[PDB]
């Protein structure tokens, strides 16, 4: 098949570089959802993840980001001009490193996503799994040091740079 995209985020903590996380995007199974995240990671539509933050980090559960429009957790937009359907639920939340869509209910995908730091089988069938951490899961674990039970972060955890690896 066509090669699944790999993208990266360079993470910073109050501006100080933390490290790089890369992700495989399962475009073979969820092409529309993978393409949204891929395009937002390169910035090629003129907007995207660069400069945005992980606004909710719950240690032992997940790190959530994707609000590049309002920078407060209520924003973000897809590349499609509106929130889009749950493409399918073929892939499951099998363990740490899973990349899955945050939503406000069925068929409300925009640009927000979370990286699981545990198996979250109770999300299967309600959040579209579309990728997985390749390298840098230790960086995601380091990110959890700035989370809290309610998810508010203690420092600004930013996607200082991002793109698509070749």
């Amino acid at each position: 098949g066509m090669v699944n995209p790999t993208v990266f985020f360079d993470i910073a903590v109050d501006g100080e570089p933390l490290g790089r996380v890369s992700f495989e995007l399962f475009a073979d199974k969820v092409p529309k959802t993978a393409e949204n995240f891929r395009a937002l990671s390169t910035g090629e539509k003129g907007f995207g993840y660069k400069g945005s933050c992980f606004h909710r980090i719950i240690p032992g559960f997940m790190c959530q980001g994707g609000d590049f429009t309002r920078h407060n957790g209520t924003g973000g937009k897809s590349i499609y001009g509106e929130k889009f359907e749950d493409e399918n639920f073929i892939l499951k939340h099998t363990g740490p490193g899973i990349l899955s869509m945050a939503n406000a209910g069925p068929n409300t995908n925009g640009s927000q996503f979370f990286i699981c730091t545990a198996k979250t089988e109770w999300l299967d069938g309600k959040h579209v799994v579309f990728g997985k951490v390749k390298e840098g899961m230790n960086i995601v674990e380091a990110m959890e040091r700035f989370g809290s039970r309610n998810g508010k972060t203690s420092k600004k955890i930013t996607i200082a740079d991002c793109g698509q690896l070749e």
């Binding site: 909710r56 719950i58 559960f61 997940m62 309002r70 957790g73 209520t74 924003g75 973000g76 929130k83 899955s100 945050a102 939503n103 406000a104 209910g105 409300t108 925009g110 927000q112 979370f114 979250t120 109770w122 999300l123 309600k126 959040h127 998810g151």
Partner: peptide
């Protein structure tokens, strides 16, 4: 429009029950 994209957190809280 703004949207509270937090349903997975509510599901986590339910699993914590």
């Amino acid at each position: 429009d703004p949207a509270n994209q937090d349903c997975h957190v509510a599901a986590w809280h339910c699993w914590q029950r």
